[PDB]
Every structure is written in structure tokens, then in C-alpha cells.
Amino acid sequence: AGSLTQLLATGSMDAALTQNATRTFWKSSYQKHSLFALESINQPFTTQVQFGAESHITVNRQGDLLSWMYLKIVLPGLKVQNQADTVQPTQQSFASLDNDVAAQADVSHVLPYIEGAYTEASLNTKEQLIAEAKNSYEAAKYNAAPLPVAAQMQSTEMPDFDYAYWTEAIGFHLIKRAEFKVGGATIDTIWSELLFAMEELMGRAGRRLTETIGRTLRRPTELMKASRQEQILYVPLPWYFTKHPSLAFPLVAATYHNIQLWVQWAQLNSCIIKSRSNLVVLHAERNVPISDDHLRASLECTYVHLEAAERDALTANAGTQLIVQHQAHLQQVSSNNVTARLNFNFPVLEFYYFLRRKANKDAGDHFNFSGIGGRDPVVSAELLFNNTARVTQKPAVWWRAVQALQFHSSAPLTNIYSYSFSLSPEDPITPSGSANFSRLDSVELALTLQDDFGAAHDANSELFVFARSYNILKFTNGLAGL
Amino acid sequence: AGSLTQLLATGSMDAALTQNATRTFWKSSYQKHSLFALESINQPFTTQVQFGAESHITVNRQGDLLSWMYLKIVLPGLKVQNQADTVQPTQQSFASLDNDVAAQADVSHVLPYIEGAYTEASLNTKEQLIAEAKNSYEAAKYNAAPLPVAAQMQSTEMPDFDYAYWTEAIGFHLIKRAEFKVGGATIDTIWSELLFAMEELMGRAGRRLTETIGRTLRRPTELMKASRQEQILYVPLPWYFTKHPSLAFPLVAATYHNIQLWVQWAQLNSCIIKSRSNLVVLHAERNVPISDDHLRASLECTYVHLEAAERDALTANAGTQLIVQHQAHLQQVSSNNVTARLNFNFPVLEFYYFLRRKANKDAGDHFNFSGIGGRDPVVSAELLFNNTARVTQKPAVWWRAVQALQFHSSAPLTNIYSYSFSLSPEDPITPSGSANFSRLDSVELALTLQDDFGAAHDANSELFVFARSYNILKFTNGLAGL
Amino acid sequence: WYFTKHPSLAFPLVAATYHNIQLWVQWAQLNSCIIKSRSNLVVLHAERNV
């Protein structure tokens, strides 16, 4: 009686929701699709792959569309030997944990707050004086309550043996820059720092790229274990056509253009960290000093094979694809107040920004975007259009956590900040907002950074700003162009 | 002036995106739906439930559709007593940690690499010699750099007291096989190993089945804590009709067919691990030896009640549902080169494969798909159609991590490999690609496994291959059939 | 086989489309394939040590 009465208890308001219902929950409807197949094919680079060099590949035409694209990287296992035991000790310098430049830079900021005879003190007494000076510095700069000295003395249990390892997220770090080219024109460009920021914000829970890029979430012991043997990494290249099947790049519609991936590789000296400064780093299998020619890479592409009728239709009329392109503003930081002039073009969906200390970069911690003592490097930021506040001054947590909560699949674990003009900037096919920067005379991101950011040992810290913008790729008569 | 100018700054390209806009972001539109209610009802098995037996239930007709289905399992708490203190010590044998068959099998592979007097050595000296021999084995087989001996000596802090526990993910392990039957015909079949693989790949972040199936992510101390008291598990049965409301099984349209769930239960000896070989395992409440009749299970079904008009429409014309069925190829492995002949039928969406060492199975670690020393058991795999490479030789990481990244909600924490012909194999209502195996004369999965896989103590290791295939379930005149 | 002796005798697969072509091989017994230095030796697979 009650359940039937609920179906009868309808009024004029229910008519807007349920009158002439076009859907039922109790019967499945499905759509028929055209026939297609997927094939994954690995392809060698056209030029030699080496650390610090640029390499390119011309993408083969082994199907009708191009869907997924992965850079397959093979890194050798690492071993170490004392320089005294080596017949040829001359190698490039690597970052070493006995010379922690990041910890030395952090100590340099607290030196003015050390009370007593620091120079003559025992090692254990120096560690105590540094921890007390950190409390005095943080009280003076941040009105922080002092932490117990014992809580600041975190011994990272480092192993009592010699090692070397590939840096955190080495699969991204290796790709300093990649360019997707069609007919000799650059269609899009991606950077190591952008790839990491995109994975932090858009990386879905349970599908994080951890193993696929050599990322351990800053657990040095896991990087050491992984680095003792050969590593095979599959780094996704997040081009517009890899984001949705309807955006797959129509190879058949671009028949008269070569499709190329160009990759600028990281220098070998930046890719490795060692336990001690006096160690030589060896290729674990070959027992020779590690060299720039030990980098191996290939391109793994997923091709789509279409039925003849769909292939012929796509060849006759591929039309236009909405694309997202990436733009970069890279700036050196030498002061706590920084203004970035964002000379980006087109309808910008969103931008990301973050800072890297010189000391973190020099320590080989390339994706450590933290400030001094691991703090947030940004105090506040403001966004100006033509000297008018588009976003008034907001604290770092608003740009990092509130923007990520509103617009992104994930909140960043590092100090990555974002701002979206789009309601859904991760939707590759549905435009949901933008600001046209080609119609603004000035776009300025004004930053107030933490105290002493870009001073002394951190002179030439880096500001990264990346923007995502809409453009249109047009296919006509076997040619493709922006 | 700027924001109004952006709305006016439109050209012929914007017309394809925004001309005659059929959607606004500033006004919600909603659809009205028909009236329905959901009811969860628990039902006993029609036959006795016991370990190692087969049991069935005829599903009641308590609503118009059948939606969710959970196997509700009740396991008793476990206690242990010394065999010497027990009036009836005769029980089935259980795996025991004082007789670690998996560790003994791993030691057997490194015996040829032990230098010195192993037989006469002290226990601590034997552990050192085994860790050194592991380095020599891994250097010889994999060109691995040696790990410090202290880093290989992981003491799992096992408690200094007697215990027994239910094996990891016991809720899946208990279900050796389940069959969904309609009118005496098997509509679909699921296996323990498939349920685990499906949860690894399709299990969403924050909705993993951990507690609901007795899974701890291989933390033995948590399995021990849970096993001291009665456990109630709710194991989801992932039938086609549980995946989307429009696929709910139309009970009213199948009025003349009995709907049955058949379950083949795991043997009790495989479900329990104990600290020591000389312990008797007791039911914690009853203080009697644990026996095959201590398994309790019931079926929890979610029924849908429809409004009379929708019920009558569905009874008159339920039509056809697209269904996904599961197929299995199960093979013994006795060599490092394995060819699996996949005699699957219908349009296959995707397949999963993985290996289990005999030693891991015998140790009661039923979902440990790792190789020797916890390594990846697959070096490479190739997929052939009619002796032509459909997927050329690819390394294990491509089949495990790249395929999961492209097509699945999650990456597996265990050595589960997949391959999809579908762009969205987790979409239950939208076909997005398949390969029709009923039109292929041969489908071969060729595997190169790690060295010594399936040799000696691992003779009769297991290969599992599961496929997901499309079929159609038809409803006509109160009957249902494939 | 006759078709391996001269190019003009190559077996015309296209002309035999409705017949399966099969090679059947009867293998020698393992006991006949091996000779050893001494009667009291066990013969092992060199790689597998079985």
C-alpha cells in the first residue's frame, strides 16, 4: 500500500522531473559502434639517444589513428667503487649526500641565530645549536612556537654502505623538453617540470605513475633498491590526442606530413645521487664508468585500425580538432617579491606555478618545490589583468589546496599552485571557461615569497609558470596545421 | 571592459563551439524519473554450506529486478592448542610458518651459489651464506648489483606466541568458483583468482574491498588480530547486472526460470595458516577442532520494486541485455617458456593473466603472484593470432603497468597482467572495441618467464588466463536465455 | 621432399587450397640418442640441473 501510494503521490512539481520519462533504470539500452582494433608498437629513435643531447623519432604510419604515446626508457643498474680503486677515475661530478648543499643552504639562513661558540663545538653540539637556532629563526620570522629539539633531530636512517641511485621521478626528469611536430611545425611542447605538475594535480588515486616514472614519494631507500638493477620506465606523453578516443590523431588525414617527437634529454650529472663525493658510478652489468651513451629510449605508440568505411570517411573529412597547447614562462628569482609577466597567448584554460630553490636543484632533488626548511615558498599571490586585480591577494593554501579541490582530480603533495578559468580544465572535449590572453595587454602574477627566498645560497632560484590554452588543429587535403 | 570584450572577441572558429549553445552553466536542468524502491534481503542457501563442498541457492522473487548481490560469509574466530594437550589431535594439515615452503623453495634456487660449509654452519652463519648466495645468483642471472647483506635480512617481527589466521583475502579464496544459472543454463562463471584480479585492476581508490573480503595487503599481524574473533564478510559478486542499474536482472521478465547461484567452496586446509606445525586449530567460541561444517554463508540480494506501469512495460517487452561473460584457461607450468592456447569464444573485450608458484600456493599465500624471491615471474609476452603477432614481444611492465594505466581504474599491486581490445572495458553498457575469438583459428599467448620458473620445487606452478567477452541475454514470454 | 629439389617443383599452396598440408614426425627414443663414458652416470640437462 505504501510503495504504490508513493507512485500515486505526484504533483505539478514532479511533472518537470518524471512526466514523459525518456529513461528507465530497469532496462539497459546500448549503442552500436563501428569496428576498430588497437595495436601497441615500439619504435626506435631516428637519431642516437644520449644524456644531455637532443634526439628525434619520425612516428611510423602503422594504423589509421594515433592514440596513446609512451616514452619507453631503459636505465642501467648502478654500482659504485672508490675512486682510488678505479683505473680511470675521471667522471662527471654527481650530487652526494656527504655534501648536502640543501641542508648547508638551510643552515646558512639560521647562522645569525646561533648563540655561542659554533666553530669550536663538537658535531653533536653543532646539531643542538642548529636546532635551537632554527627555533629562534622561526620564532623571529614566523612567530612560531619552538619545537622540542629532539623532534627536529630526525635521523634519516641512511644505510652504512656505499650506493648511487637515479633521482626521484627520473622518468620525468630525463625529459627536459619534448616537442610534438607535424609537417615541421611544433604543435605542442611539454617540460619535465610540467609533466610532474600535471601528475600531481590530474593523477587519479590508484593510477599514479609511481613505478612507471621511477617515483618513490621521496623514500631514498626505495630509489637505491630500484637503482641496483636495470629499470624499464614507461613515461606517458600527455598530448591532446592521448586524452580522449575522439581526439586520436588522424594519421590518414595528415598523409603528406611527417609526425615527429623531439626529446631534449637531461644531463647525466643531474640524474644520479651518490652516498659519498669520492665514489665513481659504474654501469652495474658492464662494470665501466657510467657515460652519456648508456641512456636507451624508444617510443611506444598505440595505433587504431579502422573499418574501411570509417577510414574513408575520416580521409575525406577529418575537419578540425579542439586541442590544448602548453606555454611556459621560466624566470630566475633573487628577491622575496617577484612579478611574472605572463606573455601567454590564446584562450588560457588554467595555469600552474611553483618555485624551485637553487639548493634543491643542486642537491639533485629536482621536484622538491619546498622553501627554506621544507616550508611553503609562497606566502601570497595576486593575479592582475591590465593592472586590475583579477584575483586579489590570496594566501598560498588557497592557490594550492582550494584551486586543486575545485578543479582537479587530486591535491598536490608538493608546493604546486594552480588557477583555473575553466569549470572542468581536465575535460579535453568540452570547453568550460577560458581567459583570452591574446586580448590582454598585461597579465601579471605577483608573488610574495617567504623571507630570504632567493637570497645568498639560493640566488637564482627558479619560478615555473605553465599555461594550458585552447587552439584548433585543422586537417585538409592530407595536410595538418594549427 | 575586458570581460565584455572577451564575449565580443568571437570569430568563425568559436561558432563550431558556442553558436546555438544548447547548454548553460548558470541554470540547472534535471530529468524526471519513474518511481522505484530498493530493498536488501538476506537469504539462506538451499543446500548445506561446508568447506570443500558445492552449495546452491535458488534466488527468491522478492522484487521486480535484481541489482546488487553479495555473498555474506561468517567465519568463526580461531584459537590454537598444542597437539599434546588435545583429547582428539587428529585434524586436517594446515600451512605453518615454522615450515615456510615458499622460503625453502627460494633457498633451493640459490643452493648452487652457496660457497663454503653450509651443512655444518650455525643458524646465523646459514642466513649470511644464503644472503651472499642470493647476491651471487642475482648477479649471475640478472646482472644485479649486490645488496648489502643487512638490507636482505628483513626480520618480519613475528609475535612470540601461538596463533592461527585465515589466509589473505579469505572472502575471495573461499569462492573457488561461482556460477550464475537461469533456467538450468549457466549464464556466467567467476573464479577466486578472477575476483582478486578484477579488484586489483577495477578496484577504485577509497572503495577497495579490504575489510569486506578479509584483505590486509599482506600484513600478517592484522590477519591474526581479525582471526581471533568471528568475521562477517560481504563478498560482491560482479555479475553483468550488478555493474549498472539499466542492466539489473529483470525477474518479472524471467518468471518461468529459476535463478540460482552455485558456489564451490575452498577446502578448509587451504584457508588457515598457523605459527607452528604441531598446533591444533580450534573454533574460538565452541572450543572444538575446526571442521568443514563451521563455514556459514548466505546470499544478500538487492531487489528493485517498480511502479506498476514500468513493471507491466518490462514484463511485456524486456527485450535483450548486452552481457559480459567470463572465460578461463588454466594451465600447469613446468618450463620458463610457456605457450597458452586461448580457446575462448565470442567478442573478447580484454584478458587478464598471472602466474602462481606452487610454493606460494602450498604456503597458503594464494594471491601471491610473484616469482622467485618476490621478482616479476614474466620477463616478456607476445600475443599471436593465426601465428601472426597481434602484439609483438613486450616486457612484463608493459602488460602490467601500461595496459592498466590505459584501460583500468587502478594499477595492480601484484603481478597481474592485462590486455584490452576495448577503449573502456570497465563500461558495462557501451561497447568500445573487441576481438572475435570465435573467428580466429588460433590465439596464442607466448610467455618468457624468469629463469628456473616451474623447475624443481616449483614444478606445477599455475598459469591463469581469464577473458571477458560480450554476449546477449534475451528475455521472451517469461523465459531468459543466451 | 620432391618440392625442395628444384624451384619448378615448389609445392603450389594456392592450387591445393582445400587440403591441409601436414608434416608428421616419429621421434627417436631418448635412450638411443645419448652415449656416456660410464654405466653408473646419470645424464642431466646442463642448464636446468635435472
GROMACS .gro file of N, CA, C and O in nm, chain A residues 157-202:
model
  184
  157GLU      N    1   6.755   0.726   0.872
  157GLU     CA    2   6.840   0.607   0.878
  157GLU      C    3   6.893   0.578   0.738
  157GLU      O    4   6.830   0.510   0.656
  158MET      N    5   7.007   0.638   0.706
  158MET     CA    6   7.079   0.612   0.583
  158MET      C    7   7.160   0.484   0.602
  158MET      O    8   7.218   0.463   0.708
  159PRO      N    9   7.166   0.396   0.500
  159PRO     CA   10   7.242   0.273   0.513
  159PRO      C   11   7.393   0.299   0.527
  159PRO      O   12   7.447   0.385   0.457
  160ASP      N   13   7.461   0.220   0.609
  160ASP     CA   14   7.606   0.227   0.635
  160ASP      C   15   7.692   0.161   0.525
  160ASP      O   16   7.791   0.094   0.550
  161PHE      N   17   7.648   0.171   0.399
  161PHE     CA   18   7.720   0.117   0.284
  161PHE      C   19   7.719   0.215   0.167
  161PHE      O   20   7.638   0.308   0.163
  162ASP      N   21   7.806   0.193   0.069
  162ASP     CA   22   7.814   0.279  -0.049
  162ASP      C   23   7.708   0.247  -0.155
  162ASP      O   24   7.686   0.132  -0.192
  163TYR      N   25   7.648   0.353  -0.209
  163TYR     CA   26   7.547   0.340  -0.314
  163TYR      C   27   7.542   0.464  -0.403
  163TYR      O   28   7.590   0.572  -0.369
  164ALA      N   29   7.478   0.446  -0.518
  164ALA     CA   30   7.428   0.553  -0.602
  164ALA      C   31   7.288   0.516  -0.652
  164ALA      O   32   7.256   0.397  -0.664
  165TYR      N   33   7.205   0.616  -0.678
  165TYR     CA   34   7.070   0.596  -0.728
  165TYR      C   35   7.029   0.703  -0.828
  165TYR      O   36   7.079   0.816  -0.826
  166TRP      N   37   6.937   0.666  -0.917
  166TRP     CA   38   6.868   0.759  -1.005
  166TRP      C   39   6.776   0.850  -0.924
  166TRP      O   40   6.707   0.802  -0.834
  167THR      N   41   6.774   0.980  -0.955
  167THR     CA   42   6.693   1.078  -0.883
  167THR      C   43   6.542   1.045  -0.885
  167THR      O   44   6.493   0.970  -0.970
  168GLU      N   45   6.468   1.100  -0.790
  168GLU     CA   46   6.324   1.079  -0.776
  168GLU      C   47   6.249   1.119  -0.904
  168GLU      O   48   6.272   1.226  -0.960
  169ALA      N   49   6.156   1.034  -0.948
  169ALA     CA   50   6.079   1.054  -1.070
  169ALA      C   51   6.168   1.074  -1.195
  169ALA      O   52   6.136   1.154  -1.284
  170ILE      N   53   6.280   1.000  -1.201
  170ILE     CA   54   6.379   1.006  -1.309
  170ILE      C   55   6.316   1.000  -1.449
  170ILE      O   56   6.364   1.068  -1.540
  171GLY      N   57   6.207   0.926  -1.468
  171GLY     CA   58   6.136   0.918  -1.596
  171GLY      C   59   6.087   1.054  -1.647
  171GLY      O   60   6.098   1.083  -1.766
  172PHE      N   61   6.039   1.142  -1.557
  172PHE     CA   62   6.007   1.280  -1.593
  172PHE      C   63   6.132   1.366  -1.605
  172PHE      O   64   6.144   1.440  -1.702
  173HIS      N   65   6.226   1.355  -1.510
  173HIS     CA   66   6.346   1.440  -1.508
  173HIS      C   67   6.429   1.426  -1.636
  173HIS      O   68   6.480   1.526  -1.688
  174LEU      N   69   6.438   1.304  -1.691
  174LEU     CA   70   6.507   1.277  -1.817
  174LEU      C   71   6.454   1.359  -1.935
  174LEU      O   72   6.531   1.394  -2.023
  175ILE      N   73   6.324   1.390  -1.936
  175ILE     CA   74   6.257   1.462  -2.044
  175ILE      C   75   6.261   1.611  -2.012
  175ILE      O   76   6.160   1.670  -1.970
  176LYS      N   77   6.375   1.678  -2.033
  176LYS     CA   78   6.382   1.824  -2.010
  176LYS      C   79   6.278   1.898  -2.092
  176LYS      O   80   6.214   1.990  -2.041
  177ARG      N   81   6.261   1.855  -2.217
  177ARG     CA   82   6.160   1.908  -2.309
  177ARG      C   83   6.126   1.803  -2.413
  177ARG      O   84   6.216   1.737  -2.464
  178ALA      N   85   5.998   1.789  -2.447
  178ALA     CA   86   5.955   1.713  -2.564
  178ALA      C   87   5.865   1.799  -2.653
  178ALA      O   88   5.781   1.873  -2.602
  179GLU      N   89   5.881   1.787  -2.784
  179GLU     CA   90   5.804   1.861  -2.884
  179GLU      C   91   5.735   1.762  -2.978
  179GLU      O   92   5.799   1.678  -3.041
  180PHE      N   93   5.602   1.776  -2.990
  180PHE     CA   94   5.524   1.704  -3.090
  180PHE      C   95   5.516   1.790  -3.216
  180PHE      O   96   5.456   1.898  -3.214
  181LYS      N   97   5.576   1.743  -3.326
  181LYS     CA   98   5.583   1.816  -3.453
  181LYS      C   99   5.506   1.745  -3.563
  181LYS      O  100   5.512   1.623  -3.576
  182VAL      N  101   5.440   1.824  -3.647
  182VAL     CA  102   5.368   1.776  -3.765
  182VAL      C  103   5.403   1.865  -3.883
  182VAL      O  104   5.386   1.987  -3.878
  183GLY      N  105   5.458   1.807  -3.990
  183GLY     CA  106   5.499   1.882  -4.109
  183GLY      C  107   5.609   1.986  -4.082
  183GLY      O  108   5.616   2.087  -4.151
  184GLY      N  109   5.691   1.964  -3.979
  184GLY     CA  110   5.796   2.057  -3.935
  184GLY      C  111   5.750   2.166  -3.838
  184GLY      O  112   5.834   2.227  -3.773
  185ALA      N  113   5.619   2.187  -3.821
  185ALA     CA  114   5.566   2.280  -3.722
  185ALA      C  115   5.551   2.212  -3.585
  185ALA      O  116   5.499   2.100  -3.576
  186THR      N  117   5.592   2.280  -3.478
  186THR     CA  118   5.566   2.236  -3.340
  186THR      C  119   5.419   2.258  -3.306
  186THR      O  120   5.371   2.372  -3.304
  187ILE      N  121   5.347   2.149  -3.281
  187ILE     CA  122   5.205   2.151  -3.242
  187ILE      C  123   5.192   2.172  -3.091
  187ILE      O  124   5.105   2.246  -3.049
  188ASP      N  125   5.277   2.108  -3.011
  188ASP     CA  126   5.278   2.126  -2.866
  188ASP      C  127   5.416   2.096  -2.808
  188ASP      O  128   5.497   2.027  -2.870
  189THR      N  129   5.444   2.151  -2.691
  189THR     CA  130   5.569   2.132  -2.617
  189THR      C  131   5.537   2.099  -2.472
  189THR      O  132   5.457   2.166  -2.410
  190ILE      N  133   5.603   1.999  -2.415
  190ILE     CA  134   5.593   1.963  -2.273
  190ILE      C  135   5.731   1.967  -2.208
  190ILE      O  136   5.832   1.942  -2.273
  191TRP      N  137   5.734   1.998  -2.079
  191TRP     CA  138   5.857   2.009  -1.999
  191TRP      C  139   5.852   1.910  -1.882
  191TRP      O  140   5.744   1.879  -1.833
  192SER      N  141   5.969   1.867  -1.833
  192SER     CA  142   5.982   1.779  -1.715
  192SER      C  143   5.899   1.830  -1.597
  192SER      O  144   5.819   1.758  -1.537
  193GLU      N  145   5.918   1.958  -1.564
  193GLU     CA  146   5.850   2.024  -1.453
  193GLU      C  147   5.697   2.028  -1.472
  193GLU      O  148   5.622   2.005  -1.377
  194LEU      N  149   5.650   2.049  -1.595
  194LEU     CA  150   5.507   2.044  -1.628
  194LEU      C  151   5.451   1.902  -1.615
  194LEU      O  152   5.345   1.885  -1.557
  195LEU      N  153   5.522   1.800  -1.665
  195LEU     CA  154   5.480   1.659  -1.653
  195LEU      C  155   5.457   1.620  -1.507
  195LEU      O  156   5.355   1.561  -1.473
  196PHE      N  157   5.551   1.659  -1.420
  196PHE     CA  158   5.538   1.635  -1.277
  196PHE      C  159   5.418   1.709  -1.217
  196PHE      O  160   5.340   1.649  -1.143
  197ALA      N  161   5.399   1.837  -1.251
  197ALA     CA  162   5.287   1.915  -1.201
  197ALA      C  163   5.151   1.860  -1.245
  197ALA      O  164   5.057   1.850  -1.165
  198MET      N  165   5.141   1.818  -1.370
  198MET     CA  166   5.023   1.754  -1.427
  198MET      C  167   4.991   1.622  -1.356
  198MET      O  168   4.874   1.597  -1.325
  199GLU      N  169   5.090   1.538  -1.325
  199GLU     CA  170   5.069   1.415  -1.248
  199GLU      C  171   5.027   1.443  -1.103
  199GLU      O  172   4.945   1.371  -1.048
  200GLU      N  173   5.080   1.549  -1.041
  200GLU     CA  174   5.040   1.587  -0.905
  200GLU      C  175   4.893   1.629  -0.896
  200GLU      O  176   4.825   1.585  -0.804
  201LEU      N  177   4.846   1.709  -0.992
  201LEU     CA  178   4.710   1.764  -0.994
  201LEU      C  179   4.608   1.669  -1.058
  201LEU      O  180   4.499   1.649  -1.004
  202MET      N  181   4.642   1.607  -1.170
  202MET     CA  182   4.548   1.526  -1.250
  202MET      C  183   4.566   1.375  -1.231
  202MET      O  184   4.485   1.296  -1.280
   0.00000   0.00000   0.00000
